[PDB]
Design a protein around this ligand. Structure first.
Ligand code: HXG
Ligand code: HXG
Ligand code: HXG
Ligand code: HXG
Ligand code: HXG
Ligand code: D10
Ligand code: D10
Ligand code: CU
Ligand code: CU
Ligand code: CU
Lengths: 382, 95, 49, 231, 382
């Protein structure tokens, strides 16, 4: 939700989320939905953002409306932080369990230590039911199946209430006696021994002994009631697998890119080659989670969030089937209301007017190639 | 010293139930780690968690007691300093 | 958070920073009015809040 | 000489109104800065509260107009004894305000980040924290200080030092809001505690210990207004 | 010797020492022995241990009972620190010269800056003779052959004794005069000039002049007696060669691993493949310097320290010659007293219950392949 306030160039030159798939948009409490896809770490990472040695695959939601039942990167569960390499592509998946009714924008994000939150596209999901029905059953290595939603609560309440009542009683022992005024006058006159009588000092011992006693008995009773207790686990998971995608034979070189200020349109001049074996065509340009498509080549079928989808936002001067070899240069224009709605036009206030994006090409058969583009964006003031 | 040493013993009976180990999808986790994993904190990634992670100069099980003695020693100086700080706050001077 | 209550940094930081106000309030709620509580009062307030 | 405006602490009803307005008009109607719903329920809130606070501070701080010859130390334990009760009513109000400002809404704002809202460029739990509660308790503290200054004899001797600390001291967290949102930007740290950017207005809660000096003072001219009548 | 006190998971997921060879176990003073082998840096390095940009190949012994006559990594002398890469294998060698009689446990260790000591397996070596016979001859770039054991000692003694006697004489000049009491009374009365007479102040000048003089003459004499003197050398040696070992075609995937608490046994479930060309068999599992062997396949011939050698510690459900392709899954059980003796069972107190180890396979001919294993270790409480 707060992606709109992040630096435009940062949103464009960090991580690119594509092939995203939401398994549902209408869940009931205790039901699960999954979010899958891939993300590609940009090699032209920002200088002020630490390289992602330590990253955490998170979920963007307003508190635990869902619970993260699981999350995988390349097939491995990632409850800890992980390491990534600039320029790699990873496949990820997240499994959510609906907990609280309402309508929530669910985003896929990556926290990067020394960097910040890197928020992917969000989708509106609706949860129906009553939160009172939520169950979080768990079985322990003793089993012992418990309900993590309310387990151990009575113990917390009892112990905290007991210690609080003990502390209140200490103050109450001294509160009945007139305080402040008589005590001031006493020490001012030189009767420093105001209300510290032997009986008042022996009450201190009882409290101090009754305290030091309860702590020991309680430690023993805990060790005897929970014989098995491990420390809080933690630690990076460096071993994370990427994707062995074939090099996009279709090579694209950006000659120059500009954008109209004011206006909701950007303009690139691409020099394209088709070192591949089949004729390709420019299908989509993806930047900062906004998808500009060319309706004549490709149309979305994944229910991509509409406010981020430009069905005919991509306009190529010549999208005639680019055949093998056959280098060519074309003028691409990606225009959509989302350029201004998602504050991408605020690249003008950024101290780095540059950009990065994902080009997708399709053959006669329907295969897709993913090419990376990046270069300076030049504000053309109208 | 007491303040520093009575803390962890005073809290253990409360957090002990949440340190039972659990095997979750092939990884081992305590119930507290499982809680931190389930209930999403979009603002608190896992890597900011400043908890004991083990080192080559650390010993197998010596963190809790050593950290409670170090804390007691430092609490000595903290109490020393804040006694005088509070004596100053009690001033009745006029300017 | 419970998953932050570890064995090294929690046990080291909590008491250190916690003993500050109890000591300061005790520096006049003892030599001016011989008030026995004052750390108890600080902690009761903190816990209530 | 009390039991009147002490029980008239409307702080609860007013603050019970925002905690409701928060959980009903800022949960989802205030999640996005966007443009329509936000500037309707949260930006207008901010502007209205700023102007109202400035004007209420300028007005309420007129104890210098009601001020006059305050030799109540020459009066018996009736007129001056009655003024001390009013001073402590003011101080109880200040205590309630400080509680709600520095404890309730501050840790509520702490709760808000941990959930979703990255501080980037704003938060609606910020209209309620830095621009409503802090100025409220600032106004109350200034009012109490001025009352003592203009109505009690023992304070006619030049601005008790510790009274200035349980006052403008806690005022220095408001301008301290510049430290954060700058330590949260180009120096950020997504916590409350290790981030020294917050240590700015950690050096404000300490200043809220100046109620050790006001209490010593108010229990030194009052101890001499009760000595004769011991039993 | 202190490896037993280091975190169990750290000892298992950092550096693996194998192919170790001690040239002798019974040396006399002035004699040399060598320690050779290889070590493999684990790619799943611990987070709290800095990556080994700066490492030093050290020797673990209780003081200089030997002297490190030399040490090579990949054939180059490494008197300075060096750099290593996660996942590489290096060949090393160390040359020791016996100096002090006794029985010493000699370990091979690697100090990692920002990390700590990484101790390899130790061996009991006995030194016989008399330390009085030790000779450390050296020839300098002037040659000038000297004995580094006692060279320049008389100079140190003479200079330090001279300066000390000079300082003692200063105090003695003032010690004969009654001190403390008369001096206190003098300045208390106002006779601050107690014993600072002109003759007492001119003695100060002599000392100050005789001092400032001796320093200059001594500097000159040193420059004239040792005309050639270089500064203390130092500096990293980044260029360190690894080993080009062929990729182990035999691929092993750990399905799950657990250990009995209490007990001295661990249990893995391995999914093995034989992409190689010959039938292989699981021979040894090496972890934390402990070697679990399967007597039916392989037996040690390098005099490996017995307390770390489990001849029949490895137990495979099916060690039938795994032939080409032919994937398979087996249950491995590595059990030995060393699991409890070397505090490896203390993985339970570690805030990271995971493990890493070295699998060795042997063909019909007798070749060896080295595969790396790692996964979470799950305490199965009996
Ligand atoms: C009032 C004395 C109670 C002593 C309790 C104790 O020894 O606890 C040890 C525990 C260490 O826990 P650990 O080494 O893991 O072994 C105990 C096993 N558990 C944690 C399961 C109880 O850490 C501390 O509580 C430090 C307090 C020192 C006070 C002198
Ligand atoms: C960082 C700790 C400094 C505390 C020093 C102190 O107690 O104050 C002594 C001084 C005045 O010294 P003196 O005239 O001897 O009066 C001592 C009596 N009190 C303590 C009431 C001021 O008061 C101040 O100016 C305030 C100190 C700066 C704020 C932390
Ligand atoms: C950052 C800690 C501030 C510590 C304040 C301090 O110790 O300074 C004492 C100083 C002592 O000089 P002062 O008594 O102001 O000068 C005499 C004042 N007259 C002329 C009225 C007698 O008075 C002030 O600081 C002015 C009030 C500051 C309020 C936060
Ligand atoms: C935000 C309300 C807090 C209530 C303050 C309070 O109870 O103090 C009572 C005090 C009345 O004290 P009192 O002794 O009547 O005033 C001194 C006597 N006079 C004014 C005649 C010189 O009020 C005032 O001085 C002005 C109030 C204006 C805001 C409501
Ligand atoms: C004393 C603070 C002044 C606040 C002025 C105001 O009403 O905010 C409007 C403007 C912000 O305008 P802008 O972000 O360009 O657009 C406002 C519309 N939304 C809320 C959608 C971003 O704020 C600033 O001048 C910067 C923040 C104050 C300094 C801490
Ligand atoms: C701890 C250093 C500062 C203490 C100053 C307290 C005032 C002097 C004591 C009379
Ligand atoms: C680069 C950050 C330096 C910060 C200086 C100290 C800040 C004090 C905050 C009141
Ligand atoms: Cu959103
Ligand atoms: Cu905030
Ligand atoms: Cu040893």
């Amino acid at each position: 939700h707060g992606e709109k306030s992040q630096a435009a160039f940062m949103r464009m030159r960090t991580i690119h989320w594509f092939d995203l798939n939401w398994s549902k948009d209408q869940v009931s409490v205790n039901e699960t939905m999954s979010i899958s896809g891939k993300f590609h770490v940009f090699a032209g990472w920002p200088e002020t953002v630490d390289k992602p040695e330590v990253a955490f695959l998170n979920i963007g939601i307003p508190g635990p409306v869902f619970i993260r039942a699981g999350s995988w990167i390349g097939g491995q569960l990632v409850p800890r932080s992980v390491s990534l390499e600039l320029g790699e592509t990873y496949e990820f998946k997240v499994l959510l369990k609906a907990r609280r009714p309402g309508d929530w924008h669910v985003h896929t994000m990556m926290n990067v230590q020394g960097g910040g939150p890197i928020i992917g596209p969000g989708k509106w999901v609706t949860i129906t039911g009553s939160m009172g029905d939520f169950k979080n059953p768990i079985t322990t290595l003793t089993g012992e199946t418990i309900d993590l939603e309310t387990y151990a609560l009575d113990g917390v309440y009892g112990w905290h209430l007991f210690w609080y009542l003990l502390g209140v009683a200490w103050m109450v022992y001294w509160c009945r006696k007139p305080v402040f005024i008589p005590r001031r006058i006493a020490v001012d006159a030189g009767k420093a021994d105001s209300l510290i009588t032997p009986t008042d000092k022996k009450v201190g011992m009882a409290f101090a002994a009754g305290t030091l006693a309860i702590v020991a008995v309680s430690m023993g009773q805990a060790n005897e009631k929970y014989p098995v207790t491990t420390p809080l686990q933690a630690g990076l998971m460096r071993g994370i697998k990427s994707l062995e995608l074939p090099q996009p034979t279709v090579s694209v070189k950006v000659v120059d890119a500009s954008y109209r200020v004011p206006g909701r349109a950007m303009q690139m001049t691409l020099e394209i080659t088709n070192n591949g074996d089949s004729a390709v065509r420019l299908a989509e340009f993806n930047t900062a989670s906004v998808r500009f498509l060319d309706a004549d080549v490709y149309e979305d079928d994944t229910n991509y969030p509409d406010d981020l989808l430009a069905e005919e936002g991509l306009s190529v001067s010549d999208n005639s089937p680019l055949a093998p070899g056959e280098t060519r240069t074309v003028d691409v224009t990606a225009s959509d209301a989302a350029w201004e709605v998602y504050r991408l036009a605020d690249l003008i206030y950024d101290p780095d007017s540059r950009f990065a994006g994902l080009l997708f090409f399709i053959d006669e058969d329907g295969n897709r190639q993913m090419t990376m583009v990046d270069a300076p964006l030049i504000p053309t003031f109208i | 010293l007491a303040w520093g040493l009575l803390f962890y013993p005073g809290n253990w009976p409360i957090i002990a139930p949440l340190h039972v180990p659990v095997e979750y999808n092939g990884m081992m986790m305590t119930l507290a780690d499982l809680q931190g994993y389930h209930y999403v904190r979009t603002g608190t990634p896992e890597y900011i968690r400043m908890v004991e992670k083990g080192t080559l100069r650390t010993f197998g099980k010596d963190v809790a007691p050593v950290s409670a003695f170090f804390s007691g020693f430092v609490s000595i100086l903290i109490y020393f300093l804040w006694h005088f700080f509070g004596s100053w706050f009690g001033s009745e001077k006029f300017v | 958070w419970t998953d932050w209550k570890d064995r090294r940094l929690w046990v080291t930081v909590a008491p250190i920073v916690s003993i500050t106000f109890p000591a300061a309030v005790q520096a006049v709620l003892w030599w001016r009015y011989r008030i026995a509580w004052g750390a108890t009062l600080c902690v009761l307030g903190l816990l209530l809040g | 000489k009390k039991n009147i405006i002490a029980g008239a602490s409307l702080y609860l009803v007013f603050y019970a109104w925002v905690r409701w307005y928060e959980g009903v008009y800022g949960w989802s109607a205030g999640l996005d800065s966007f443009a329509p719903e936000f500037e309707t329920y949260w930006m207008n809130f901010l502007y209205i509260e700023m102007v109202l606070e400035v004007l209420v501070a300028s007005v309420l701080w007129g104890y210098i107009w009601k001020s006059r010859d305050r030799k109540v130390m020459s009066i018996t334990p009736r007129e001056e004894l009655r003024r001390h009760f009013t001073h402590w009513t003011w101080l109880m109000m200040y205590g309630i305000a400080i509680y709600f400002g520095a404890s309730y809404f501050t840790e509520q704002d702490g709760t808000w980040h941990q959930t979703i809202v990255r501080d980037t460029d704003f938060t609606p739990s910020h209209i309620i924290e830095f621009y409503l509660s802090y100025p409220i308790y600032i106004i109350t503290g200034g009012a109490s200080f001025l009352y003592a200054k203009t109505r009690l004899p023992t304070y006619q001797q030049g601005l008790s030092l510790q009274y200035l600390v349980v006052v403008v001291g806690p005022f220095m967290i408001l301008p301290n809001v510049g430290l954060n949102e700058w330590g949260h930007t180009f120096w950020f740290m997504e916590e409350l505690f290790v981030a020294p950017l917050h240590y700015g207005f950690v050096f404000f809660g300490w200043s809220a210990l100046g109620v050790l000096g006001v209490i010593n003072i108010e229990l030194g001219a009052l101890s001499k207004l009760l000595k004769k009548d011991l039993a």
